[PDB]
Amino acid sequence: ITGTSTVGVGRGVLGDQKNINTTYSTYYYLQDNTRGNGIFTYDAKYRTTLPGSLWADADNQFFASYDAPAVDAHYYAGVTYDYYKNVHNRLSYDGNNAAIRSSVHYSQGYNNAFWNGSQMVYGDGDGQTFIPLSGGIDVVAHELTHAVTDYTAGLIYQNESGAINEAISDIFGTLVEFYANKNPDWEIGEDVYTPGISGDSLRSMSDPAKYGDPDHYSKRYTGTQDNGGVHINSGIINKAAYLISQGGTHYGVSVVGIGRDKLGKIFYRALTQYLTPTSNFSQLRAAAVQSATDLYGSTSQEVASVKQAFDAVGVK
């Protein structure tokens, strides 16, 4: 809508207070005009019809329990936009400042979040397995990254290309978490997963096997479930990414870590310049090596580390 840009205040899912960019026109709407063509957050009102209604508030204060998921979806979409713009010089997910839209309160007791090809959608969780999904910055960044992948490499969501698609979302979801410096870690979804259990997460990049996911190509899932195991086999790539950044010895292979910033530069270049819709793990290795070569030179430590990491997880 057309209005006056202003700033409101509210509390997120985890009870933290934060300022959010809103727009005033009779009501105060969750519409941020400071980023690209805007960030819009909608209320799905427990229904499955999308996008729902643009979030309207009477006083620009968002401290109601019902407001929490909206506050975080709106705020974290902004942080993710900032990350891509400031670190990778990318304007929104399409590179041309496309408006970012999110709907919260999707369905009832919905334990999922997703990108539907046009916008982000967040369930409220059942209160046992998950609390409102937008409360996790790595979750929000994971979803917006699916949009970035769709507009660039276009990795098909099946088998190995799908696992790469998933890993890319976990990798950048984690890098955004570090960017925001919000209790950063290499775990996925820890802030909104199982509120009754502390110390766990949905997936782990540092040790995928902790939750039963493969950490070596020899342990890859070859079944048909989960579109060929896209959320399972992503562990192989997530582990490789973790090793490239942090280093370590895995299955007898030692990797010298090169840091998170370089990891991000290497994978962003691979994603936007070399990967294609049908790329498999072997091609991802080639793309990553080429990207590191472009940026640091063929005889650099960076290239060596990328090769070592993929060797460690059995990807040739």
Annotated binding site for Zn(2+): 142, 146, 166
* CB contact set of 24 (below 8 Å; sequence gap of 6+): 3, 4, 5, 6, 60
Distance, in Å, from the CA atom of 66 to the CA atom of 307, rounded to the nearest integer, reads: 48
Output the smallest distance, CB 166 to Zn ion, in A.
5
One-letter amino acid for residue 287 of the chain: A
Per CB under 5 A, the segment of 16-24, 59-67, 163-171, 286-294 that binds Ca ion is 59-67
Angle between helix axes 260-269 and 301-312 (nearest 10 degrees) is 80
Query: Do the beta carbons of residue 187 and residue 179 sit within 8 Å?
Result: no
Among 183, 212, 223, 316, binds Ca ion (CB under 5 A): 183
- Which partner, Ca ion, Zn ion, none, binds residue 169 by CB below 5 to 8 Å per kind? Zn ion
- The one-character DSSP state at 98 is P
- Which partner, Zn ion, Ca ion, none, binds residue 138 by CB below 5 to 8 Å per kind? Ca ion
Binding mask 136-175 for Zn ion (x = CB under 5 A): ---------------------------------x------
Place of tokens 């959010």: 20
Binding mask 168-187 for Zn ion (x = CB under 5 A): -x------------------
65 binds Ca ion (CB under 5 A): no
Among 48, 61, 108, 116, binds Ca ion (CB under 5 A): 61
Closest CA to 198 of 187, 209, 182: 187
Distance, in Å, from the CA atom of 167 to the CA atom of 158, rounded to the nearest integer, reads: 13
Is 160 annotated in the active site? no
- The one-character DSSP state at 271 is I
**Kind and range of the H or E run holding 188:** strand 187-188
Strands 4-11 and 17-25: antiparallel
Mind giving me the DSSP string for 10-46?
EE-TTS-EEEEEEEEESEEESEETTSTT-EEEEE-TT
Q: How many angstroms separate the first and last alpha carbons of the chain?
A: 52
Residue nearer to Zn ion on the CB measure, 129 or 300: 129
Per CB under 5 A, the segment of 81-89, 195-203, 236-244, 264-272 that binds Ca ion is 195-203
Q: Nearest-CB residue to Zn ion? A: 169
Catalytic residue chosen out of the listed positions 74, 88, 105, 231: 231
Closest CA to 102 of 70, 79, 80, 132: 70
Residue nearer to Zn ion on the CB measure, 124 or 170: 170
Residue nearer to Ca ion on the CB measure, 37 or 194: 194
Query: Do the beta carbons of residue 179 and residue 83 sit within 8 Å?
Result: yes
Residue nearer to Zn ion on the CB measure, 25 or 116: 116
22 binds Zn ion (CB under 5 A): no
Is 143 annotated in the active site? yes
Residue nearer to Ca ion on the CB measure, 194 or 272: 194
Catalytic residue chosen out of the listed positions 74, 88, 105, 143: 143
Binding mask 73-112 for Ca ion (x = CB under 5 A): ----------------------------------------
**Kind and range of the H or E run holding 261:** helix 260-269
The CA R_g of the chain, rounded to the nearest whole Å, is 19
Output the smallest distance, CB 228 to Zn ion, in A.
14
Among 111, 194, 272, 300, binds Ca ion (CB under 5 A): 194
Q: Site residues (CB under 5 A) for Ca ion?
A: 57, 59, 61, 138, 177, 183, 185, 187, 193-194, 197, 200
Q: Which residues bind Zn ion (CB under 5 A)?
A: 169
